[PDB]
From a paper:
In low G + C Gram-positive bacteria, CodY is a global regulatory protein that controls the transcription of numerous genes. CodY from B. subtilis and most other low G + C Gram-positive bacteria is a DNA-binding protein that is activated by the branched-chain amino acids (BCAAs),2 leucine, isoleucine and valine, which may be viewed as signals of the metabolic status of the cell, and GTP, which may signal the energetic status of the cell. CodY from B. subtilis consists of 259 amino acid residues. The structures of full-length CodY from B. subtilis determined here reveal the effector binding domain and the DNA binding domain as discrete entities separated by a helical linker.
We have solved the structure of unliganded CodY in three different crystal forms containing 14 (form A), 10 (form B), and 2 (form C) molecules in the asymmetric unit from data sets extending to 4.6, 3.0, and 3.7 Å spacing, respectively. Examination of the molecular packing in the crystals of unliganded CodY reveals that the basic building block of all three crystals is a tetramer. The tetramer in the form C crystals and one of the tetramers in both the form A and the form B crystals are generated by crystallographic 2-fold symmetry. Superposition of the eight tetramers from the three crystal forms suggests that they are essentially identical within the limits of the data. In the crystals, four CodY protomers are assembled into an unusual tetramer in which four wHTH domains are sandwiched between two GAF domain dimers. For the unliganded form in particular, the tetramer is compact with extensive subunit interfaces. From within this tetramer structure, there is no possibility that the wHTH domains of CodY could bind to DNA in a conventional manner, because the GAF domains of partner subunits in the tetramer occupy a substantial volume that would be taken up by the DNA duplex.
Numbering used by the authors:
A (entry chain M), B (entry chain N): 2 to 258
Amino acid sequence: ALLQKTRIINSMLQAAAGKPVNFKEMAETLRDVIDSNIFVVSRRGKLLGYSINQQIENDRMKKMLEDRQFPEEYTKNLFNVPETSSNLDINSEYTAFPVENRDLFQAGLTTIVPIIGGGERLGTLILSRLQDQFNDDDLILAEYGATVVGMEILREKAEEIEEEARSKAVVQMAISSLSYSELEAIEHIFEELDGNEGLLVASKIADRVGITRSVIVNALRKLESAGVIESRSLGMKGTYIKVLNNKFLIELENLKS
Amino acid sequence: ALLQKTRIINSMLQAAAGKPVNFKEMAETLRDVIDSNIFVVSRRGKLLGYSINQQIENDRMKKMLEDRQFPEEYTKNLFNVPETSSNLDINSEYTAFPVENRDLFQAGLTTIVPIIGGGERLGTLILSRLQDQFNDDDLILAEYGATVVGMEILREKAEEIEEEARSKAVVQMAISSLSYSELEAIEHIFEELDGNEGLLVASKIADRVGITRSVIVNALRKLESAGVIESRSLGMKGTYIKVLNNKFLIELENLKS
């Protein structure tokens, strides 16, 4: 069980991947292969992956998952030591944790595990064993279970730079290449409208400022072309409106200046 | 030495580094740990740099240093190596290599390692020795050290896709806020010029064509703070125009009509 306990956790390790990137799925082979409780915590205490394995009743886990957040001094003291710890509980070989908070280790043979998945430090991987101690073939996995999570913290937060950052730019790259009419079109079309969606006249809103009628069509022959929306435009009843892009609404409100 | 000589490889781990990747040095910190030849061959079958110390007899590992590329059948053959099988010279075990292509292992005990990463094949990292074999603890350094060769492949090509994407795009954005007139200026500016570095008069250049100077004032005061050109705006006498952007006026050539 040195080459077989690392070959069922692999049937779960994903690199970015298509199916939902979720920590509430990441410790599947860390409960019956490590056979130990798994906590996946990020830098300053913010919870994205939880779940105790065995019913151990402490007074900082009976009120902790109740908040979904590490409190006051659980943001400045869970991010200091360069490496792991051997056999943590009410006893500690040295000053493992501050004398103000010796209570995170009262219920379990706990093991705070460092995530090093890119040449850095990604929060914590807090374990808490019932009776059995951490020895040989269930310690390397408690460490390996931190980087089976560490190909996904920069894959549930690095989808926050590829999709979230881009969507701003395109929703500007299309707006940039608009002449004044079409730029006054889409600004009056989506302000005098049903917040989210819309459906009204084809060109009765057109020349009530001074603009023309058919320049309204090509204004939409921009968004549809750059790549923002879908609209089954009827030549018999105005037109159809429903957004596709997720970040266009905000960059439409804050434009009154 | 399975965690002390690994801080000569995990500490070599320079994520993107910060300097335009050098590829022989990346093949030198695998030479001061396992102690062997290094051949960082990528996916298409090309070569980038080599750290060889001892003189070993070889046949097509020396037409791979001259050409830097394999002819005909190797790109097909070494495309079919899944993981890390240990020690294959003139004698393997199954149908791993053709007999006509078997001359890649003749002399010495060479152990080929694939560079798997991100969920795809990136190439073969070739290591060859003379009279020492890759033992029970000499090759997981080429397994954990094949997870990160692709790092500076998804950081070097990743600073030649975002680096290129941004270019051709910024090269276009500026083009946009240039009204047809303001464009006409650019079409005349670079066409009558010597080399990349060119400069001539303020009053003349304009109505020589017919255009005003006023729409070169603001026209070249767009690409200025946009991010395309630097030019010391001497209102006393014209100005000198050098580009901040490379493949930019190459977008001016093909877009004639």
